[PDB]
Design a protein around this ligand. Sequence first.
Ligand SMILES: *[C@@H]1O[C@H](CO[C@@H]2O[C@@H](C)[C@@H](O)[C@@H](O)[C@@H]2O)[C@@H](O[C@@H]2O[C@H](CO)[C@@H](O[C@H]3O[C@H](CO[C@H]4O[C@H](CO)[C@@H](O)[C@H](O)[C@@H]4O[C@@H]4O[C@H](CO)[C@@H](O[C@@H]5O[C@H](CO)[C@H](O)[C@H](O)[C@H]5O)[C@H](O)[C@H]4NC(C)=O)[C@@H](O)[C@H](O[C@H]4O[C@H](CO)[C@@H](O)[C@H](O)[C@@H]4O)[C@@H]3O)[C@H](O)[C@H]2NC(C)=O)[C@H](O)[C@H]1NC(C)=O
Ligand SMILES: *[C@@H]1O[C@H](CO[C@@H]2O[C@@H](C)[C@@H](O)[C@@H](O)[C@@H]2O)[C@@H](O[C@@H]2O[C@H](CO)[C@@H](O[C@H]3O[C@H](CO[C@H]4O[C@H](CO)[C@@H](O)[C@H](O)[C@@H]4O[C@@H]4O[C@H](CO)[C@@H](O)[C@H](O)[C@H]4NC(C)=O)[C@@H](O)[C@H](O[C@H]4O[C@H](CO)[C@@H](O)[C@H](O)[C@@H]4O)[C@@H]3O)[C@H](O)[C@H]2NC(C)=O)[C@H](O)[C@H]1NC(C)=O
Lengths: 207, 212, 53, 55
Amino acid sequence: GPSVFLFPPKPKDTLMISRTPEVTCVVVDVSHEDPEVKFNWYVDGVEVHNAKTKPREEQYNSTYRVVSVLTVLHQDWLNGKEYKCKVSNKALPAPIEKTISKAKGQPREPQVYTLPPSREEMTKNQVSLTCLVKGFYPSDIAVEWESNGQPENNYKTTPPVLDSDGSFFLYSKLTVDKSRWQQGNVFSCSVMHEALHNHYTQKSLSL
Amino acid sequence: LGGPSVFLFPPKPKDTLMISRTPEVTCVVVDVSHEDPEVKFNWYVDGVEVHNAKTKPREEQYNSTYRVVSVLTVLHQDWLNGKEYKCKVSNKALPAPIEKTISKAKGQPREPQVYTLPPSREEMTKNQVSLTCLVKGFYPSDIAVEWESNGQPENNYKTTPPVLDSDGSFFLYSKLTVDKSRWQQGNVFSCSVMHEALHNHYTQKSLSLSPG
Amino acid sequence: FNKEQQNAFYEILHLPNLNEEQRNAFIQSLKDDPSQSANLLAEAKKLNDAQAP
Amino acid sequence: MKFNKEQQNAFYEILHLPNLNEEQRNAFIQSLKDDPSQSANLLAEAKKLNDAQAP
Ligand SMILES: *[C@@H]1O[C@H](CO[C@@H]2O[C@@H](C)[C@@H](O)[C@@H](O)[C@@H]2O)[C@@H](O[C@@H]2O[C@H](CO)[C@@H](O[C@H]3O[C@H](CO[C@H]4O[C@H](CO)[C@@H](O)[C@H](O)[C@@H]4O[C@@H]4O[C@H](CO)[C@@H](O[C@@H]5O[C@H](CO)[C@H](O)[C@H](O)[C@H]5O)[C@H](O)[C@H]4NC(C)=O)[C@@H](O)[C@H](O[C@H]4O[C@H](CO)[C@@H](O)[C@H](O)[C@@H]4O)[C@@H]3O)[C@H](O)[C@H]2NC(C)=O)[C@H](O)[C@H]1NC(C)=O
Ligand SMILES: *[C@@H]1O[C@H](CO[C@@H]2O[C@@H](C)[C@@H](O)[C@@H](O)[C@@H]2O)[C@@H](O[C@@H]2O[C@H](CO)[C@@H](O[C@H]3O[C@H](CO[C@H]4O[C@H](CO)[C@@H](O)[C@H](O)[C@@H]4O[C@@H]4O[C@H](CO)[C@@H](O)[C@H](O)[C@H]4NC(C)=O)[C@@H](O)[C@H](O[C@H]4O[C@H](CO)[C@@H](O)[C@H](O)[C@@H]4O)[C@@H]3O)[C@H](O)[C@H]2NC(C)=O)[C@H](O)[C@H]1NC(C)=O
């Protein structure tokens, strides 16, 4: 019959107090016959009741998708509390349970290094500004770029990669017009991670 | 219970690119139960059956399951020219035999640009430093990256997966970690990249402590 | 984002001698009124120090 | 990778010779695999055949 998938909050939402982290329980393959779905949420085994279920939506299939969203406390996620979604619906012999939590293990501070374009890349119209972020644990992390107070959005960030020592690393690549770089504009790589002071640090890069 | 499952894996990008290597396609059958375990493979290249495949002896798994693998050696040129490889898995007690087909990603090949980047000045306070190799603009994503120094392989490196860029091409980074001392002493390090859109399927960039 | 708020949140999160209820309450107040970050952090610091062995 | 540059090069260029047919190309490549020392000869041989079979 139906399946259930449980998604953690965005790393940034749990780290920034200005933001609202959510755990999202998604039920798929929901029958047209018996489409009334019931959720039970649990935080460390104790049931909570503040979850908001979206009105069931029609899918590609002749099937519905139904989503419930549990608003969570930043501190609770970061302190390792377990969140359980329990879905009940007649097209299942037993109700399905899914549990997630932040990865266990000693947090490690990400080292953030900015690297200028390779000398050879300076023959191109666009150049790459590189932000190396290494030695962080867990892999939950967010990276952004900005210049003169304003966000730079022409960037791509690799997924986290497991390193030799059990920590993670990644690279973020910002692409700018060579001329912008030549003129001495300052660029900043912003990294958000729990093992950082204030969950935030920022490294600058200019010619 | 729900029958077994079959997963078909392509050859390592390097094996198809280097003539000195032997590329393989690998057919893996999981959820083989202890009660049916006599799996039979049929291999096809563009619909035509071939017979050179070799089968590994059944192996018992974690979950009281069995796992059985069939390996087909392929021609470099065939994979690169887009030929389809089919694995067909059969049992006396499969309702129907399962078929899986794979082939190289279609699309105009794009030549990668390879750039080496030295350690950040900030990192020079550590005992180990990161040497970086940026490879951008390549298509398809099938690629191999290696490091070496004084003719010999360095192996304390990690390479990010390929990442889709704005323009539909891929990029990645490879990170080599060396002792700072080795860097300070002028040791030369090389980033070797292998990709079909490169001449000889191979290019290399070097990196050492040098005049800025 | 508000730097003082984010900073106050971070520190209160790590104050070792607050209990869960005390910590949650300061943080809630932070969420509800960003302008109260300075006082709430000073308040939480003293309570933490008061509850030192 | 200790690998033979001359062999690898001969393989690459033969792979891209536009006027060979599949059977001819495969045969040169096989010979390359079987005897790396014949790479120069096999590449020269394949080049001429390719040129001979030009439009
Ligand atoms: C009938 O049709 C149904 C419609 O779905 C369609 O199906 C496919 C075939 C195609 O037609 C599509 O056009 C279409 O999607 C179909 O439903 C699907 O069913 C399969 C199950 O068989 C599901 O498969 C996998 O599901 C997981 C991946 O889903 C995530 O990623 C997708 C792409 O990356 C994306 O499409 C999904 O929506 C989902 O994305 C996540 O969404 C969450 C929830 O919102 C996001 O998190 C929240 O986001 C908020 C902002 O919006 C906010 O940030 C909040 O704080 C935050 O909590 C999150 O951003 C996002 N994440 C990602 C990464 O995208 C996948 O994980 C799973 O695999 C895991 O589990 C397996 C075990 O079961 C493991 O084997 C595996 O390794 C891995 O661990 C599934 O493989 C599919 O997702 C379904 N579709 C949708 C939309 O959910 C249905 O199956 C059809 N009927 C039948 C009978 O087949
Ligand atoms: C019973 O146990 C078995 C035992 O295997 C398990 O091994 C690991 C994974 C761990 O879970 C242990 O606890 C177990 O003992 C289970 O077998 C697995 O079954 C999975 C499906 O049920 C199957 O899932 C994915 O398989 C594809 C990837 O397989 C790769 O990569 C993984 C890790 O990335 C390796 O562990 C594998 O060995 C295999 O490695 C590749 O091997 C090639 C051949 O040797 C080699 O050439 C490659 O270089 C090498 N690659 C790497 C990266 O190492 C994955 O791609 C699939 O993705 C699909 O996802 C969806 C859903 O399937 C589909 O729609 C997509 O289109 C993709 O096709 C699979 O998700 C897994 O591979 C199996 N493990 C092995 C070792 O074969 C079994 O499931 C258990 N059964 C039950 C009932 O519990």
